[model samples]
Target chain A: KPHDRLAQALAEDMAAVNALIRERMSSEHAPRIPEVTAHLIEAGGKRLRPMLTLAAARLVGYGGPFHVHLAATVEFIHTATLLHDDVRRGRPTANLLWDNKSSVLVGDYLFARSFQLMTDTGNMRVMEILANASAVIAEGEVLQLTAAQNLATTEDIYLRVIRGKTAALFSAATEVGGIIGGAPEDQVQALFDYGDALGIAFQIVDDLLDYTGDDFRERKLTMPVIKAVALADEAERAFWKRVIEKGDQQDGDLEHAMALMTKHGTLEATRLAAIGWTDTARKALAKLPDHPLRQMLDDLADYVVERVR
Target chain B: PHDRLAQALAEDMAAVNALIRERMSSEHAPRIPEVTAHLIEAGGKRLRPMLTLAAARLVGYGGPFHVHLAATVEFIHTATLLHDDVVDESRQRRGRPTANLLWDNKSSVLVGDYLFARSFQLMTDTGNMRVMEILANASAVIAEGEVLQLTAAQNLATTEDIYLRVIRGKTAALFSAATEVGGIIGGAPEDQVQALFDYGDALGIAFQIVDDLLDYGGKSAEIGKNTGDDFRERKLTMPVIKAVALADEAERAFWKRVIEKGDQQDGDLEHAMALMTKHGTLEATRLAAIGWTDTARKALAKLPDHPLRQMLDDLADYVVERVRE
Candidate 1:
């Protein structure tokens, strides 16, 4: 509901950002580009990151066309990553319909287009911020590859990986808006801190839901499973290794894993982790000047964790 | 001759090489440095950075930013190659195994992206908006060309025009950008900068055409053939496109099965090469390379006359001259 409120508050600017995303996704020679990107851009995930860009700019009392471009830049980066994920995961629609090859190529196109859009603003400072963030994001994705599906992956590694994979862009989406908004240094840092915590909390909640969801489960290793398995005794460790670490899961493994999580209270512990991150996100916003959009951002932060609740 | 040119710019090349090694390193992700070093360290010939350095020295630049441009071009080149190897499902590059073959597609894709981002960071460090715009446009064009090539692959209807577009994207975009950014960083006069751009563009086009021709000719022992590689890959190169243009309906059917449907079987390479030979498509492919090679040489006349310029001219001749055998 708060996401809907935030989306409505930034509706007009979000529309323009969507327009820019569609326009830049088109390539004269590569028709498959639009076909691939259009399927992704319509996937109905909350456009939360770009909304943060718009909200950050508006909350700082700034009015500039560059924010819309930056918003589009953020979306393009997000969509590009999704296209890559789709390729690695196997896909169809316009995606799998054309094959995984199209997914990777179009993703690269979107990344190039995002770089082009960011440079169009002609702001050197903004360019540097986004460019550094882009590098950091790539580094994060590579880091994720190493940490994934391994028993050695610890909470420290998870936090570092998720921060890069999730928070790098989130912080960038807000920090850039602040840089363009002419927000003072302290407030700019606050916006960054806010986005960082918000994204961390967002990812944590998503990880929690996968364990708690009644529908399709992700078979992914998240905090609850990581924590739950970390506490396993010798007998349980063997099951954890076979099912989760070695990925040799058999039938009833999900149910057994769910039972282990409940026994260890890790599912509850994961909820507490999300709540803590939301609080951290709320505290970061306190450094900024008051605005209704900031209030919505605060609401959105809580709303992310609300899913798990 | 290129070895001599590389020697002539050894000092600059060392700096560029040093920058690439230093920047390609990652503190948190060991895989980033590993995958990147595998491809970039096993680098081909170092001609791209050599061009950037030569272009900069020709225009009388004395600063260190040309080194950055040189490394930037190499990074972009490595990035594109990484992704291409994945898309083409390549095994061996130059001599050893490809990054994708050694690691996996996931590592290749992400590491390639990291290099591209690093390349952008390097270019932006130069603080030239014109340089950024040029590199950005080149990057977009390269990506677009690759996607276009993917769609164009195995399609019999692909024309010579489409073939040019594909090769230009695959080869010339970075080549042209490599030279142009060198001039832009050097603060060269507009005409000379334009000349560098033209020279590199023509040079890249010529270089790729020769590569395509070598693949078609089945010159395995003399040339390091991926030989008749284009034939096997179902890629519609210029010679193949030319052959298809002149194919009889019967020839077309065989090729459509081999090229389009990928129903390649025994003696397919021989049939494809024979078809090219019978139609004179190979000769035409050679002629096109020569024309582009001459265009590259001619553009050097607009450049500031230096020993490096002469090396570049010789280099242009070297690319197409390999096909004469």
Candidate 2:
């Protein structure tokens, strides 16, 4: 996988970041702090987001310095969000294993730690970028909360949610890497664009997979479902209203929902949208300096949509 | 009589209020302002920001950035309040409904995060790296403290040491940060900065102890919140911790049942208050608040004499006046 390639290429830097993450996440007073933090971080997911930071920096010729801090900051921020909610991939969330209060506090501690790490870089521009991204991510979370279970949710609203919650961090991750790497404005903007598009592509596929894949019991309104609801006829809209809006579900509702999506071609249309975003992501790299990491990043975009394709 | 410091600092407080109103608005999310205005415009004392303005001005700060720092401190406090409601499952704050109750827990959490980010941006606008570092470290301490309190709550084993640490984290961390950053922005001498930090720390401890005492129905305690609210919540506050140490075998069983086991009846709060009174723990806690005020005054005595300094000293006394003669 392109992620594997990037991980192997940035192995040394990632090692340092992992060590730094361990060192920073530990609490001297609150023993529960490290206990909760280690649960999510040690779950052994791919270091995809931090790798983007490293790859962007290395591609733009950054060496031996603050990229490591920035990468760790990105990971800490990601881990913090995952702790705050029960919306991760198929594992037990911190909130479930512990309690909701632990989730909130541990998430807050990680956020504060992320800020401290960013300040160590002494880069005000980088600080501003991450701060702006943090605000956007929170805004997106609230937007999603308010929009949930409402039949009036539009594709535009879904796009904004994904952009704020997912893509803002992604673009900030990549853009900070470029800034620390001394990239010009064009390259920095290009990095931001690439991350922005890749994140959209990434989240769209993830939302699509909630239906085609395993158990996603939250009845969350995502891209595929939104598309199907938008195209629903009289009876189909009734079904959506019963299950998605009113939360009245019985046996075989999942099957009915999938069938409705298949009938409307909304799933296929969603896949096409993911492919379109991947293309935008790939084309974003064109403005940057030509490098091997750039090519891997381009392949990474393709890899993101290949699941749906 | 009350809020002499506020009256003296009215102009600066108005600036802080203006900056707060300006920064809390969000172009992208209208809900930000909706939630913030509900809490920020509530008729609270705005004590934290006033501390910042006082510390900076007392140290002869001439820059316009103290207003920004004051607003930033209030934002952190407001953000903490928002998050605290969700964590504590609280319904009322300052005689009004909490944001979590009025809207939802999710809104409170996200709006709290937004305010935190906004506070960081405001500190960044000061363009002083040291101020950012102080506030960042304080923010981390505040969160760590909240986590500590969560783990320590409803437990009989929570000692006075742990109780102090928890209050310092949740309360004093922000208070000290509020004043410490103000002094740093003022470019005060190192000793003066330390003095401001100490004063803020002791003042916050005193303030929290008094609040804890008020919950247990301290002397002349008609200031804020309902009596025995902490008892109802089973929170191991200062008075309870002191009383538990002096509990006899039968009293220990009562504490275990009501607090640790979470069993409560009609007379549980009354019995708890009686136990605290029997052990003189309420008076002990009252003296503790007074002692902290002394520490706060002594810290302030290190600073130069000014009207704001005198007002700060009076403010420290005012924090504990409810429990004193």
Candidate 3:
């Protein structure tokens, strides 16, 4: 019975999501549409948030067309933020390297087109939820821009930014799916709590990976806890304070700093902290009804940390 | 009664149009919004299509909402031209220096944003199917026109070759849209509606040609700016291309310096204008304007015989009157 249920849920959700992605990305204008979409889609990150949407719909027993549109809507929003973030940071963009201005424009086009699709679903509640989320997402991005590279960044401030930038969308994604699928209010709220906990755990693990994981060392800055711990030693602390915190150092200074972090056991400490959040995520999932899907999700919480190990 | 009717319509339309211009120009990003709004709302002939509001009301368009759509169609046209001015590197427009020269490209882009948002809000206010479709169709055509102009620049195509595409996108699309909205809201007969669109198209074509003619010979003050600005920019406009087609080797060499290299000395403007005059390209352009003006008059023959139609006829004539001056 458990095996049958899991297979049934994945089949319907994946089919709906795949169809939605194909339909929404089309454009009559030149090469821009295909170029922009190909970059993020081909980058090979797990579609975990979309899967949460699908799982929520299955749990609530929804068998309608609007869920497909909502799932696609979430993906488009994610894709747009990534493109705009790269552009605003002036990083060498996937589109620019590929000779495709279409990626930027088409990303914008998909954003607008997603709104058009949502409005067509004829559910004003869904519209209000998604529209409010879009605005909040924009505000979150701006907040991150204002806060990045400051040594005064505290744990409270970091958590708030992470909620706005990362978890708010995830919570909205799951909650909306539950609401549209006809779940009870308590069940919907439970799913929202579960998503929020999972999201925080996911981000903390991501931060930890930057310090401890071999795969993550090449990309991203060193984890925040590692930087905080390094500030304890006088000479090591002064080096970080001047270079990483004050941003006074030239190129290759960050790599040298990472070697110092490794020497101090800060990387191992961050991994332990991630294991603690994974524990909290498991507690949040305990509120939901017991089913094979719920068990799979609980396992997925373990999967978030398993990557770093 | 007719005077009172016309006065009230003008007042109401002006009030709505002003509100639209105000909403579209506001911005949070300091100079970008202000400069764009300044360029867009800067007082120019607002005449190209303001006549549509008057025409719609004069023909018993009783609905209060056509004003929003009329203003929207004009704002779309103005926004496209604002961006085009930057793309084409134009320095002067509508009797003032262009926005790009006055502000910068970044401001031009943002202001263009403000105007587009304003246009969308205006269309949403109308909440009518046919009106939305009309404006959307015009916008698609306008984008297509810009693409064509980019491709045609610096190429020595025939006078007819460039004229039809540029005039269609740049001038005629908005012109036709203006009168078409007027007729759509006016509740005019089906055939008469077609006539209004035809009239506006002809009048727009004529106005553009006469402006080209004036660039070749008409007085700068009377025309509101210097002549041959288009030639100095090496735009490959009708008069210059017509002259180039029939030139000898020395003339061809001169064309190379002026049109291709874009290196104009003190005497080059007068020489270029003289050659256009010598080739009768200026006269040919004027004749084309006259022909379109005649077609415009013929289209107006379908409308009810009224003082409003006479004003439209006068407006068409006003387009070329400076050339004659």
Candidate 4:
């Protein structure tokens, strides 16, 4: 229901973005390209990243038609990253045989399509930003794989990883919108800061929920576990050394992790940290000339935090 | 003697290799370089990038950007190989383990994505939109070809025409893109760029066909696991597909049982080879390679004469090396 407002405000541009996505995603010979891509694309992602593109462009008075292309570019990169994530996570990447290769090749197809779409814009600056963002996002993802299940991961490393995993694309999306709109330097940087902080908040809340919510196992180190580990006693450290560190998880190990988080009050602390990011995101909009889109972005930041609360 | 092109461009290719090594490194994903190093650094023929470098060099462009495009092409090829290892379930490629064998499937898939994404960053550095368009479409064409191969793995109705289409997409797309980008970055005239594309396209098709012929046991073929490896996979390669066209009813039944019906006796491989020889598909396949090599030579002659072009011409002859050995 809340998305209705964001949808209605940018209704025409969003439709154009959708049309471009559908047009570019189709392949004549490789039917599986559309099929595998459709499985993810048609399933609704809030189009939040593209919304960032659209909203930032509109706010900056970008009247050119290329915002639709830029929005579609953002969506394509996002979709491609997810497909790569599936393959990297060893998830059943395709629906046909539920095989890995379908996801792998199709993921590659989307990455190429994204490149083609950006080149279509003929905006060399936009290409540079998206290109660099991909490298950072790619680097962050591999860092996560190398991070493994280690308990020694500091909050600083976690921030750098989150900056890559979550904020890089968000900041890129918002930054490119301003760039496309021909916004002055400071306004574009403002949008970048807004997006970066909001993405960090969103990721932090999601990580917190993994500890607080159902259906999450504590193998991967998150902010909560990272904090809890910092406060662990020798015995708790050994418990983690076996369960979380070595992954020699026992039956009661997850509960022990939860108990340690409870003892250290790390879950609530992580939540407060998320709220701080949300506050920063909200504040970043202060310098922008006031508009309904700004109101919507403020609401959007709250909505990201409310996702946990 | 056949390694002349690489030796000719050894300095240039060394630059390409350096860029490749630098780009493939990750801050945390040690597995990325580890899996990639053995495959890339193990010293396979770096012909794809050589084409890119040679095309650029002949056009009298002396910039370092050709190194970027060459590495980009190799990164794409490596990405495709990583994924193909998982899809084809290949264990060892010539007494050596592949990425999926040394590591799990997930690492290869993920690392392949990293390589592909990094390749994009590589091309983006070249600052040429047309070059980007050429390389990106080449990546798409290669993806399309891989998807087709996945769908058509053991199907009997695959025509040589369709097979030829696959060769162009799966192999020729990269080769053409590799050369096309080199000429493009080198600022060659339109006709020269297109000609290099044609040369690369023909060269790739010829190379792939010869590989298929040798695997099915042409003259002097070794007993590599890949020898009849296509038959074991039930792949309807050109020789077998040709056999299907000419087989008698009994032989047709044998092919259908082994290939289409997935019923193979102990003697199936020998029987399949016997029928292939009887049908003269092996000879036909050999001739097809020569034909493609001729096409490559013809395309090469259109380009400005240079040492690299000569090596590429010699490279065509090398494709049929096992056939004559």
Candidate 5:
């Protein structure tokens, strides 16, 4: 509901971002670009990422048409990664309706459009922030792919993956908003910290939710599973090696996996870590100038983890 | 002659090569450079970068940014090739295995993305907004063309106009951008910039036409190991599209089975070649390349007379001459 409040607060600006996203995602030559992008956009992901950008700019008491550009840029980047990761998992919908080929090429078009949108801001600083973020994003994706199925994936590697895959863009979204708003250095860094923490907590909660949902069907190495594996005993390690590492899951494996997480209290510990990040995000927001939107951001941080509770 | 062009622009090419080597490196992910190096350093002609360098040098511009722009053009080309190989599920590029096969599809996709981001970073470092705009627009056009090509594949109704659009995205968009950005960076007048863009545009089309023609052995009866690759892939290149247009009902049925339905059988390559020969589509395709080559030569004539200009004109001829046999 806090997301709804943030959306309402920045309703007009969010509307403009939607308009720009629609306008830019269009291709005169390739109708498939818009066709594929429209399907993903219409799925209506709370538009959370771009809203963070809009909220950050407004919270800093800034007024400019470029924030909308940056917001749209953020959304384009997110949508591009979604199309790409879908193919990494090789998902349905766009990939099914069109093909992996369409997904890859259209995702590329969105990235180029995002770059074009960012450059339209005419602020080299904003451009650098986005360029760096894009690189970090690709690095994260590559790291995650290479790290997949490796039980030795450490907490450091997990942190790096999430930071690059999720936090990099979130922080870039907020940081660019601050830069365009002409916010002070400390405030810009604060915005960045808030997005970084928020994105990590967001990814952690999603990973935690997966254990309850997929029952290791996805077999992704997340924070809870990684934590559980580190603390796993000889028998526990053997069980994981069979189900997760070796992909030899039999019936009742899901129940046993849940039992192990419960015995080790990883699910609860993961929830606590999410809360810790939300607290850090709230703390970062305190460094910014006080505004109603800032309070909504605080609520938004808490709401992201509220799903696990 | 191509080597002569390489020698002519040796200093700029050296800087461009070094820049590519340096920029392709990753501080965090070692796989980034490893996968990129597999194809980038696989002895590609680096002709696209040369276009940028030659355009800038010919326009009498003296700036280090032209080197950056040259490297940017190559990076875009490299990134697209990386993705294209993945999309096509290609096994080999340049000579050895493809990055997608050597690593995985994910590495090719993501590393290509990293290169694209790095390219933007390099161009932004130039501090020229117009260059960014030109390259950005070119990137989008290139992507659009690729998607267009993806859908147009194996569809017999694919027109020559559609083929032109596809090849423009597959090749010309970057080629024109490579030259146009060079002129923009070199502070060329509008007329000269337009001329540079036109030359690269025509040259890229001719270049791609020649590449497609070579896959079927052009007008020659000899077929190499890579011959019929486009046929196996079911790609409707200029030659195939022209042949399709002139096909009778039986020939149409043959194409539909092999290309549209993916039911290629033995001797299909021989039959396809025979049909193309019957209609002179291969020779017609060669003439198309020559037509574009002439257009490229004419476009270059509009630019200032320089040694680089002559080499560029020769390069356009050289692109088509590979298939002339």
Candidate 6:
């Protein structure tokens, strides 16, 4: 299993993870849980966190059943947090018009239920890791809320928020898999690093795509960096100062801002930046031994860019 | 540690439980989860659920960790229901205007967070068999209760009345589980099983009545919200329906306008309150609450009296005291 590509060798395990998500997302109590859940899940997120667990366990030669449960547990926590974050941001969620109330409550139910699922494994270490991650995730969410729309939001602050908001879960996902699969401490840390880098790269590419991607035709906003650059420009700075900073965009003013971003080549700049991070992701996988799984991970990094192109 | 029992031990545990509530309620996150939790965690008469832990400990049960576990379960039940009330747009909660009205949806979200944090810590402390089972079971039932309420609202033909099932699921189910955990951990006798069951059921019934009666009889200012507000929402609560049945043609037309048509007038609340008073529905509801309270006291006869037990009795009386004119 360790020598094989995760996409091929872990098909049954992946199927189990998928099945757990499907079953658990169904709320016998509230139709809204399933409704909101399907919005994100069906929106075609790569089940990377759960897959990391499966891959780590197989790599460490773990023959136990607990990995399956752990994989599902992590995914539930991730999905739950996403729902909550969307609600916290006052953003329109995937389900049921933009009702944050449903998102918050249903997200909470999922988080609680995730803890319950983790307890089913009867592993105290797993519980400690997941519970601590849950706390960190909350803190990270609060940090992001504070940082949003702040021009002084430096790359370091961005790194901290993304690590907390995204990579923490990814690292925990693989770390638990390694532990359950009987990987030694060093191997567990290796998997953790692997997941952490992969997650950070994934998010960087996502942030980049939000600006440059013509693939997403539904929305019309420049990426965060483009907006940042616009805020920094001398003549254009006044426009951003009023529109982006003060939120005083008049009719057709945002369209003019987008035209300015295009003239500044911010879109191409964001695409190139995403490519650089994607290369970093591939470099991180170099520590793993020669295997098809390694190659698939390399391909997955490229895949993050493919959508944007 | 399930073999030691003394009268003084129960009192000490109850004190610890009180201290836990005091310390865990946070003033930060002032908006969402924080404010919603303040309504739940603040000086809440924690009698119905805490009795479960106390009962378990009193029966020669030496579990070192049941109290926190029981308390966490209770907090989860309380927090989830508070969220439900906000979702349902309930105007009054715990005899006051709900947090959603006072704060906003955002605060309800955060305060729910703080309560969940407290609950998670409490559950983790127990480190017992499947903490998930205790909580997940309760959560599933609570969600089902919410769904049932949504389905039952304004639909009068539901069998046995969906309201009773909804209340039992939302309110009594948690109450029963709270006490059942006490016996399960306490290693009490099988014959005494019915005692905890009856206690939770009667206690929940009594609790719901105190809420309804207060809406009819308690001072609006003292309660921190308007009385008869539920009727304004056109909820077919027991007192309102009884008054509707006893109304003359003119009164019935008013009920139709406010309730059936969902178009209420400013003067309608006064008229509705007057009709409820004239028909003695408020008095009948209070009497019903007393009956349940008596049953609750009777259920306590099976257990040995300790400070905790005495407190539970006082707690039950306190639930109804505000409603009795």
Question: Which candidate number would show the highest lDDT if scored against the true structure?
Answer: 5
Return the TM-scores of chain A for each candidate in numbered order. Answer: 0.91, 0.93, 0.80, 0.93, 0.95, 0.76
Model 5 reproduces a share of the real contacts of 0.69
The single-chain TM-score for chain B of candidate 6 is: 0.74
lDDT of 4: 0.82
Top candidate (TM-score): 5
Of the candidates numbered 1 and 6, which has the greater DockQ value? 1
**RMSD of every prediction:** 2.5, 2.5, 8.1, 2.5, 2.3, 6.2
State the lDDT of candidate 2 residue by residue for B9-58, as single tens digits: 88998898888888888776789889999998787788899889899999
Question: DockQ for all models, in order?
Answer: 0.64, 0.59, 0.10, 0.60, 0.71, 0.26
Instruction: Supply candidate 5's per-residue lDDT for B29.
Output: 87
Question: Tens digit of lDDT per residue, candidate 4, span B1-325?
Answer: 3477778788988899899899999876677888888788655777888889989998888988999999999998998888788777678764788888887777777777778878887787777989888888888888888888766667878889878877788898999999999999999999989889998898899888988898877843234556777887787678888999997898888888998878877977878888888778888998898898899889877788877778778888887776762
Candidate 2 docking category?
medium
TM-score of every model versus the real structure: 0.94, 0.94, 0.61, 0.94, 0.95, 0.76
What is the per-residue lDDT of model 3 for residues B1-325, given as tens digits with 9 covering 90 to 100? 2333345456765765676656554322345445556665667566644656766865778767667776776666666766666555577776688876886543453354345445544555554546555665555555545445444556665467665767776678778878887888778887878888898888888877777777766523222345766776577667777788978888888888887777789878888777777777777676778888889889988888776777787777777776663
lDDT of 3 by residue, A20-75 (tens): 77776654433345455766765644677677776776667777667777877778
Assign candidate 6 its CAPRI class: acceptable
Name the candidate, 1 or 6, with the larger lDDT value: 1
Per-model tally of clashing residue pairs = 2, 0, 2, 0, 0, 16
Best-first order by TM-score? 5, 1, 4, 2, 6, 3
Which segments of candidate 3 are over 4 A away from where they belong?
A1-309, B1-9, B25-33, B90-103, B219-225, B248-250, B261-266
Model 1, chain B: what is the TM-score? 0.95
Candidate 5, B69-103: lDDT as tens digits: 99989999989999898788889887889998988
Ranking, DockQ, top scorer first: 5, 1, 4, 2, 6, 3
Worst 10 residues of 2 chain A by lDDT: A210-219
Worst 10 residues of 3 chain B by lDDT: B25-34
Q: After superposition, how far is residue B254 of candidate 3 from its true place, in Å?
A: 3.4
Error of 4 at A68 (Å): 2.1
Report iRMS (Å) of candidate 1.
1.3
